C-alpha cells in the first residue's frame, strides 16, 4: 500500500509582530491540502463543501483528515474558518485560515541592517512518509506596490523544500517507520533602516563628533568639565535608544557606537588631565590632537 | 489484586524562553509521550491505530482508559496543540501531545548577570496513586545547538531526570496516599557578554571619571563637577532600570550604581572638609580616594 500523496499550497497574507528577544514572529494566511482518499457518495454526486463544525461530523463517520502540524509554531495557532471539498472520486481539498506565532533562528547583531529568514515548517503529526508524503509545495505571497512604508523588504521569491526527517527514538522491529515528510517554506527579508539611520545613527554621530570640540577649548578647566557634559549626553542618548530599540541578549551596531562614545570621552578626559599635570607647565601642543583624536577614533572604528 | 500500570514517558524540549524574573516563571515548548500496555484489542489490518484530537474523546467515552497527567509546576492550563493516541493490537497505548506552558521554579538571580538556573518540569498523575499507575522510566531529548553566542542562555550538561514518590498526609481516607512523579531539570548559565560591555563597562568608566574631581584646581570647580557626576549616575541608574530585569533584591550592577553614589557623595564631603580645615594637601587624595573605594569594594 503506497503512501498518500498530499499537495500543499500556502498563502501568506502578512508577516509582522517580530519579537526579537523570543525570536518569534506572526504569520497570517491559508493552508490548502489536496489528496485523494476513498471514493464516496455525495449529494448529486457533485463536489461537496463541508465547513467548520460539520467537518467533525464527517470524521466520526469515517472520513480521513490527517492533522498537519506546524513544527515551528509557538502554542496553538488561531484557526479561523476551515473547509473540506469532498469529491465522489475520493479527492479531498482541505482549506483553512490560520494566524500563528512562529519561531526561528534570528541574529539581530547587524541591526538595523540585519537580514532575516522567516520560515514555516509543516509536517504530519502522526503519519510517517510510508503513510503520508508531501508531493509538492506551492507558496503564494502578497503583491507589493511600494515597500517604502513597510518595516521589512522582501527579497526574491519564496523558497520551498520537501525533505524527510528521521527520528532515532522510533526504531521498531518493523523498520522504515521512523521517517516523516516535512515541507519547509522560507521568506527572505531585509530590515528597512531609514528611520534608524536618520533618527538614531545620525544624531549619535553628531553627539560623538561634537565631544571632540573640547580640544578646541583653551582652558584646562573648560576642557575637563565640558567632557562631563559630553559623557552625560551619551548616557542620555543611551536610554533614548534603549526605549525604542529591541531587547536582545547581545550587542548590536548602535550598542557598539555607544560604548565607543563612552571610551572616546573617557579617553579624552585622561588626555586633558595628562597634558596638565605631567610636564616640566601646561602642554598646549598635545592638545593639538583636535585632528589626531578624531583620526585615531575613525582608525580604531575601522575595525 | 492487579499491579500498578507501568507508564514510560519521553519529553522533547524544543525551547526554554520567556523567563520572568519577578514571577520566577519560564516558558517551555515541547512534546510529551506516554506509553503503557492495555488489554489487547482488534485493529484494522492488525496494524497500529491512530486517533487524533477530538476523536480521542469518542474512544474514552467508549471505555478506553487514558489517565490525565498534570505538570505539577505549570502555572495555569498549558496550551496543548495536536494530540494523538496510537493503539497497538497487543495492547500498547502511546499518548503524544504538543504542549506550551508557563512553569514555575525557585530561581535565584542574585548573581545576575552571572546567575545559573535549573529549569525543571514536574510530571505527576492527577488522580491515580502509585498502586494504580507508576512511571517506569523517563527519557529527555533537547535541542541541538549550533553556536550559543546568539543564545541568551548557555546550556551545560545533559538533562537530569528523577522518578520519585510523593506522599500526601491529607489522603488518609489504607495505603493509597502516594503518587509517582517525574522530574526533568535543565541546567543553564546566562550569557553575560551583553551586560559586561553595555552596562558594567560604561558604569566603570563613569565611576572612574568621577574621581577626576580631585584634579580640578579650584574648590568651586571640584564641588560643581561632582553634581554633574552625581547627575550622570542618576541618568545611568535609569538607563539600567529600564532594561535589566525587575527583582526583589539588588544585583551586582545595582551595588555598582549604589557605589557610584557613595563615591561621589564621599568626595563631596572631602572637598568641603578640606576647604574649611584651602588645604590642597589632602586634595592630593587623587590616589587615596580610588584605592579606598576598591579596598571597600572587596568587602
Amino acid at each position: 500500500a503506497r503512501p498518500v500523496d498530499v499537495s500543499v499550497s500556502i498563502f501568506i497574507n502578512k508577516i509582522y509582530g517580530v519579537n526579537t528577544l523570543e525570536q518569534t514572529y506572526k504569520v497570517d494566511g491559508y493552508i490548502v491540502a489536496q489528496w485523494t482518499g476513498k471514493p464516496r457518495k455525495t449529494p448529486g454526486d457533485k463536489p461537496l463543501i463541508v465547513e467548520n463544525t460539520q467537518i467533525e461530523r464527517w470524521i466520526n463517520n469515517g472520513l480521513w483528515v490527517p492533522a498537519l502540524e506546524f513544527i515551528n509554531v509557538v502554542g496553538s495557532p488561531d484557526t479561523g474558518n476551515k473547509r473540506l471539498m469532498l469529491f465522489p472520486d475520493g479527492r479531498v481539498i482541505y482549506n483553512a485560515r490560520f494566524l500563528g506565532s512562529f519561531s526561528n533562528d534570528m541574529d539581530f547583531r547587524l541591526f538595523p541592517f540585519d537580514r532575516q529568514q522567516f520560515v514555516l515548517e509543516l509536517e504530519p503529526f502522526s503519519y510517517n512518509n510510508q503513510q503520508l508524503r508531501f508531493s509538492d509545495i506551492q507558496v503564494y505571497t502578497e503583491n507589493i506596490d511600494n515597500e517604502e512604508i513597510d518595516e521589512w523588504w522582501i527579497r526574491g521569491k519564496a523558497s520551498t523544500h520537501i525533505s524527510d526527517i528521521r527520528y532515532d527514538h522510533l526504531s521498531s522491529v518493523q523498520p522504515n517507520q521512523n521517517e516523516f515528510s516535512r515541507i519547509t517554506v522560507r521568506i527572505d527579508a531585509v530590515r528597512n533602516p531609514s528611520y534608524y539611520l536618520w533618527s538614531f545613527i545620525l544624531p549619535l554621530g553628531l553627539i560623538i563628533a561634537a565631544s571632540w570640540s573640547v580640544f578646541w577649548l583653551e582652558s584646562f578647566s573648560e576642557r575637563l568639565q565640558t567632557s562631563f557634559t559630553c559623557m552625560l549626553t551619551v548616557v542620555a542618548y543611551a536610554f533614548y535608544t534603549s526605549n525604542i530599540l529591541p531587547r536582545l541578549p547581545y550587542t548590536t551596531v548602535i550598542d557598539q557606537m555607544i560604548i565607543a562614545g563612552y571610551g572616546s570621552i573617557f579617553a579624552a578626559i585622561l588626555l586633558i588631565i595628562f597634558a596638565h599635570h605631567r610636564q616640566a607647565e601646561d602642554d598646549l601642543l598635545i592638545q593639538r590632537s583636535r585632528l589626531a583624536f578624531p583620526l585615531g577614533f575613525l582608525a580604531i572604528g575601522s575595525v | 489484586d492487579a499491579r500498578p500500570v507501568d507508564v514510560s514517558v519521553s519529553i522533547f524540549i524544543n525551547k526554554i524562553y520567556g523567563v520572568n524574573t519577578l514571577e520566577q516563571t519560564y516558558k517551555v515548548d515541547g512534546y510529551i509521550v506516554a506509553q503503557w500496555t492495555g488489554k489487547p484489542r482488534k485493529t484494522p489490518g492488525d496494524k497500529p491505530l491512530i486517533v487524533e484530537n477530538t476523536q480521542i474523546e469518542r474512544w474514552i467515552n467508549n471505555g478506553l482508559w487514558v489517565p490525565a497527567l498534570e505538570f505539577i509546576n505549570v502555572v495555569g492550563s498549558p496550551d496543548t496543540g495536536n494530540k494523538r493516541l496510537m493503539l497497538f493490537p497487543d495492547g500498547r497505548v502511546i499518548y503524544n501531545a504538543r504542549f506550551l506552558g508557563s512553569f514555575s521554579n525557585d530561581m535565584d538571580f542574585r548573581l545576575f548577570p552571572f546567575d545559573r538556573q535549573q529549569f525543571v518540569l514536574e510530571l505527576e498523575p492527577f488522580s491515580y496513586n502509585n498502586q494504580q499507575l507508576r512511571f517506569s522510566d523517563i527519557q529527555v531529548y533537547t535541542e541541538n545547538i549550533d553556536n550559543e553566542e546568539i543564545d541568551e542562555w548557555w546550556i551545560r550538561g545533559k538533562a537530569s531526570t528523577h522518578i520519585s514518590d510523593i506522599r500526601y498526609d491529607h489522603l488518609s481516607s489504607p495505603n493509597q496516599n502516594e503518587f509517582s512523579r517525574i522530574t526533568v531539570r535543565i541546567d543553564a548559565v546566562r550569557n553575560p557578554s551583553y551586560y559586561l560591555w553595555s552596562f558594567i563597562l560604561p558604569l566603570g568608566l563613569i565611576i572612574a571619571a568621577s574621581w577626576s574631581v580631585f584634579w580640578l584646581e579650584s574648590f568651586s570647580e571640584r564641588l560643581q563637577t561632582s553634581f554633574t557626576c552625581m547627575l550622570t549616575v542618576v541618568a545611568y541608574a535609569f538607563y539600567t532600570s529600564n532594561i535589566l530585569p525587575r527583582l526583589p533584591y539588588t544585583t551586582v550592577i545595582d551595588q555598582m550604581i549604589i557605589a557610584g553614589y557613595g563615591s561621589i557623595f564621599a568626595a563631596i564631603l572631602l572637598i568641603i572638609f578640606a576647604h574649611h580645615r584651602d588645604d590642597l594637601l589632602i586634595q592630593r587624595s587623587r590616589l587615596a580616594f580610588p584605592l579606598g573605594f576598591l579596598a571597600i569594594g572587596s568587602v
Epitope: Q116, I165, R166, T184, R186 | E143, N144
Partner: nanobody, 124 residues
Framework: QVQLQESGGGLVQAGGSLRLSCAAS????????MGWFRQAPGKEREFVAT????????VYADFVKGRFTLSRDNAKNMVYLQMNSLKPEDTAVYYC?????????????????WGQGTQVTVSS
C-alpha cells in the same frame, strides 16, 4: 577560521556502499553545524543531510529514501555519512559544509568553509 576535509569516496558498483568522513578544524564548537551536500557535473549543488533541531532527529533530502545515515563523533569533531544501496544517480562530488547562520539548514547559502570534496562514482 574553520577547515573541512572530506574522505571515503571512490568507485563502487550499483548497490554498493561507501562511508564518507569529514574532519573539522578551527573555531568550531560542535558538529551540529556540519552538513553534507553533493554536486554533479552541470547540476546545482544540492542538499543531502544534516542534524535535526531536536535531539534524535536528522534531515535528509527526498532522494535519500532511507539509504544514507548521518552520524557523528563530537569528541573528535567528525561526522560520517554511510551510503548504502548506491545507484548511478548518486554519482557526484560530495562536499562537507559548516552552517554559518540563517535559519534554513537545507539551504546551501547558509553554509561555508566548504571542503575540497570527495568523488563518488557509482558505475552502471
Amino acid at each position: 577560521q574553520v577547515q573541512l576535509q572530506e574522505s571515503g569516496g571512490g568507485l563502487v558498483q550499483a548497490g554498493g556502499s561507501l562511508r564518507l568522513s569529514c574532519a573539522a578544524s578551527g573555531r568550531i564548537f560542535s558538529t551540529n553545524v556540519m552538513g553534507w551536500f553533493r554536486q554533479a557535473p552541470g547540476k546545482e549543488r544540492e542538499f543531502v543531510a544534516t542534524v535535526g533541531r531536536i535531539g534524535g532527529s536528522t534531515v535528509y533530502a527526498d532522494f535519500v529514501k532511507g539509504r544514507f545515515t548521518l552520524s557523528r563523533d563530537n569528541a573528535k569533531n567528525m561526522v560520517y555519512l554511510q551510503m548504502n544501496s548506491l545507484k548511478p544517480e548518486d554519482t557526484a562530488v560530495y562536499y562537507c559544509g559548516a552552517r554559518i547562520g540563517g535559519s534554513d539548514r537545507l539551504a546551501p547559502e547558509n553554509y561555508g568553509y566548504w571542503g575540497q570534496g570527495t568523488q563518488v562514482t557509482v558505475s552502471s
